[PDB]
Structure formats: C-alpha cells, structure tokens
Amino acid sequence: IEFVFKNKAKEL
Amino acid sequence: ATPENYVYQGRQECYAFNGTQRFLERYIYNREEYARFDSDVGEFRAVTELGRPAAEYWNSQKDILEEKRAVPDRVCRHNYELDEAVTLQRRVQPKVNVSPSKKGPLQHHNLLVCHVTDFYPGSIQVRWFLNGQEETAGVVSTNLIRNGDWTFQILVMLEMTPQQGDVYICQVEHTSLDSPVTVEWKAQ
Amino acid sequence: IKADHVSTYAAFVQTHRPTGEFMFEFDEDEQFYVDLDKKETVWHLEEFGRAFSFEAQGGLANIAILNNNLNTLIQRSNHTQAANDPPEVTVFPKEPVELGQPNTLICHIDRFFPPVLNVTWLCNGEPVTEGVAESLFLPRTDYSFHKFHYLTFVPSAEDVYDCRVEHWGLDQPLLKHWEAQ
Ligand SMILES: *[C@@H]1O[C@H](CO)[C@@H](O[C@@H]2O[C@H](CO)[C@@H](O)[C@H](O)[C@H]2NC(C)=O)[C@H](O)[C@H]1NC(C)=O
Numbered sequence: 545i546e547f548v549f550k551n552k553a554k555e556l
Numbered sequence: 557a558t559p560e561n562y563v564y565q566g567r568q569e570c571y572a573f574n575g576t577q578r579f580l581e582r583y584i585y586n587r588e589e590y591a592r593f594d595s596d597v598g599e600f601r602a603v604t605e606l607g608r609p610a611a612e613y614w615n616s617q618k619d620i621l622e623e624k625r626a627v628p629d630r631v632c633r634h635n636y637e638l639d640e641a642v643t644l645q646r647r648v649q650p651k652v653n654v655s656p657s658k659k660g661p662l663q664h665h666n667l668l669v670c671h672v673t674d675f676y677p678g679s680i681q682v683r684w685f686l687n688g689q690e691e692t693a694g695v696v697s698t699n700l701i702r703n704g705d706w707t708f709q710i711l712v713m714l715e716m717t718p719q720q721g722d723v724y725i726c727q728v729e730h731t732s733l734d735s736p737v738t739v740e741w742k743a744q
Numbered sequence: 745i746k747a748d749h750v751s752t753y754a755a756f757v758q759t760h761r762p763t764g765e766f767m768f769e770f771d772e773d774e775q776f777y778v779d780l781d782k783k784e785t786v787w788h789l790e791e792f793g794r795a796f797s798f799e800a801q802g803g804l805a806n807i808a809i810l811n812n813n814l815n816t817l818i819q820r821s822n823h824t825q826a827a828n829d830p831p832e833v834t835v836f837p838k839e840p841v842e843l844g845q846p847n848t849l850i851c852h853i854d855r856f857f858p859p860v861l862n863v864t865w866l867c868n869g870e871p872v873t874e875g876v877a878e879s880l881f882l883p884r885t886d887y888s889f890h891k892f893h894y895l896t897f898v899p900s901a902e903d904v905y906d907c908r909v910e911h912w913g914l915d916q917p918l919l920k921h922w923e924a925q
Binding site: 558559560561562563564565566567568569570571572573574578580583584585586587588589606609632635636638639641642643644646651653655671673674677701702703704705706709 | 747
C-alpha cells in the first residue's frame with residue numbers, strides 16, 4: 545500500500 | 557482557478573543534543589503530516605486519521621521497525637560525525653561596515669547602521685558604543701538574515717543625534733574571531 | 745525538541761514542475777541535493793564535495809517511494825487539493841551598497857505553497873537573464889517553502905530593480921522593489 549522511506553548516509 | 561496539483565512531502569530529521577541522536581521521520585500529504593516515526597516512541601504513530609492504514613501496517617512488521625530503531629546510531633550519529641569534521645568547522649569571518657542611513661545635517665537625528673555581512677555560523681553579538689559608553693537603548697536590529705548561501709547577515713542600527721567630535725564604535729563578537737572587532741565613525 | 749544541531753533530509757513530489765526534489769539540510773542550510781534528471785549528487789560548496797559523497801540512488805529511490813505514496817493518498821483523500829498559501833517576498837543586497845563595487849541582489853520568496861513559482865529579475869522594467877542564479881525550493885518546518893534568487897549587479901544611481909513573482913495564491917504578479925541609496 546504505502547512504502548517506508550529509505551535511510552542512507554553520507555560516506556567519506 | 558488553480559490547476560490540478562497534489563503534493564507529497566517527506567522529512568527525515570536527526571536531532572543531536574548532548575551525545576544523543578533523536579530520529580524523527582514525517583510523512584506529509586500537502587501541508588499535513590499524518591504518519592511519523594519518533595525514536596523516543598519506538599514505533600510509527602499516525603498523527604491524523606490519514607495515516608492509520610500505514611501506522612498499523614508498518615508496525616507489526618519487524619523488518620521495517622528494527623531498521624528504523626537503529627537509524628539514530630546508523631545514519632544520524634554517523635552523519636553527525638561526518639558533519640563535525642567539515643560542516644561545524646566552517647568559520648567565515650564577519651565583514652563590518654558602518655554608515656549613516658541618510659546624509660545631511662549634524663545636529664539632526666539620524667540612524668547609524670552597523671552592517672555585518674558574510675559570517676558563519678549565525679550566532680553573533682553586535683554592540684554599540686558612543687564615546688566609550690555602551691548605548692543600551694535606541695538599538696534597532698533586523699535580526700539575523702539568512703542569505704541561502706551558508707552565510708548570514710545582520711543590520712544593527714543606533715538611534716543617534718550626532719554632535720561634532722562624537723565618536724561611535726560598533727563592536728562585533730563572533731566565534732570566528734579571537735577578540736572583538738571594532739569599526740569607528742566620527743561625526744564631522 | 746532540544747538539539748545543538750538539526751540534520752534534516754527533506755524531499756517532495758507533486759503534479760506540476762518541479763515534479764520532485766531531494767536534499768539534505770544542516771541547520772536549515774542546504775548541504776546537497778540529488779539532480780533527479782542527471783542522476784547525480786550536487787554539493788553546495790566545494791568544502792563539502794572535497795570530503796564526503798552520497799549515493800545518488802538513495803535519492804532517486806526515495807523519490808519513487810514518495811511518488812508511490814503520492815497516489816494511494818490522492819485516492820485515499822478523495823482527491824484533496826491544498827490551499828494556495830501566498831508568498832512573502834523580500835529584496836535586499838548581499839554586501840553594503842558601495843557604488844561601483846559589484847554586489848549580489850537577493851530575492852527571498854518565503855512562506856508559500858505549493859512549490860510552483862515563476863521569478864523574474866527586472867532591471868529598469870526589462871528582465872535580466874545574464875548573471876542570475878537561484879536556490880532550490882527549500883522546505884520549512886511548517887511544510888511550506890521558501891526560495892532564494894540571486895542577481896549580480898554593479899550599483900548604479902541610474903538603475904532600478906524588481907523581483908517579479910508569480911504564484912497561484914496571488915491574484916496578479918507580485919512586484920518587489922529595490923533601489924540604490
Ligand atoms: C508561470 O508562467 C506560466 C507561463 O508564463 C504560467 O502558465 C500559464 O498558466 C495559466 C493559468 O495558470 C494558463 O491559463 C496559461 O495557459 C499558462 N501558460 C503557459 C505558457 O503555460 C504559470 O501559471 C505560471 N506559474 C504560476 C505559479 O503562476
């Protein structure tokens with residue numbers, strides 16, 4: 545029905 | 557008669573205080589936030605009736621909920637450490653110009669504007685002095701103006717009535733400065 | 745919420761252009777966004793791109809998610825359109841106005857919704873196309889928007905500038921004026 549948000553991050 | 561338009565918004569917010577990281581997550585139809593994850597809560601909670609089909613279904617699914625609980629230490633604290641190496645250490649020095657608002661007579665009332673530009677971060681202290689004494693009244697500040705380019709700007713005006721020989725000094729205290737910076741203006 | 749600093753990923757999708765946008769802000773200043781057409785990450789300052797990087801897939805994916813829940817919410821709300829919140833516009837210079845020293849004129853459009861907007865830099869009635877730039881549709885914590893528009897110029901006592909704004913919440917184009925001295 546509704547998709548959850550994806551959590552990424554900045555990487556060096 | 558506005559054209560047809562439907563807007564969906566999303567916000568992933570990390571709150572860093574002390575040593576902590578509070579993960580907020582907001583699901584937003586138009587300008588209404590309906591579903592939300594709060595790390596202090598541990599599960600999705602519908603803010604409005606619009607988000608009940610999601611909050612209950614997203615909850616009780618362990619693969620999603622466990623990923624979301626580990627976010628404060630997986631991207632929040634992780635990004636924050638990356639920001640402390642670069643973003644926090646950015647220090648741009650305030651440039652200070654002083655001028656009257658309008659030019660004209662001497663004994664006529666006027667406004668002395670201390671224009672502080674292009675500094676970062678935004679926490680700045682501006683003070684006014686007349687003949688060595690802090691003017692604690694008649695100070696009109698257009699509080700902190702964000703420029704949208706990682707630089708701030710502020711105008712601090714003093715209600716003055718300049719006499720011949722009067723000396724006005726603007727003092728600026730910013731984290732990017734070792735000592736207060738002063739700019740002077742004499743009435744002549 | 746008490747916080748020394750706030751680190752907010754923010755994104756939106758809508759029917760008209762801009763159809764999508766994805767960015768990350770640190771203390772309400774945009775650090776980087778994801779060009780959804782060129783499929784790339786764009787860092788606001790060289791200080792940033794010299795240090796870290798971002799998976800442009802993480803933005804494009806969140807946009808497809810945002811689009812999937814855009815619908816299923818269009819339908820769930822019986823096709824609810826939001827009110828056109830009209831913009832507030834300010835025009836101010838970047839540096840003190842010294843006649844001769846090149847400057848940057850800032851047009852700040854604030855407190856508007858939806859994120860659809862036309863902006864035109866007018867010098868003496870005529871529009872300016874060369875030497876202009878603009879920020880993104882920047883989200884606010886009350887889920888409206890604000891935008892920044894920039895024009896580099898040399899202060900002339902013979903010149904006059906306007907920032908013309910079009911929004912569905914305005915009856916006519918809004919003209920905000922700035923003048924030297
Ligand atoms: C930005 O400008 C365009 C065109 O300059 C506007 O598009 C017009 O919109 C009106 C009503 O919204 C229509 O009747 C016209 O046919 C459109 N013309 C074109 C060429 O698209 C657009 O509405 C403006 N944006 C805003 C927010 O006002």
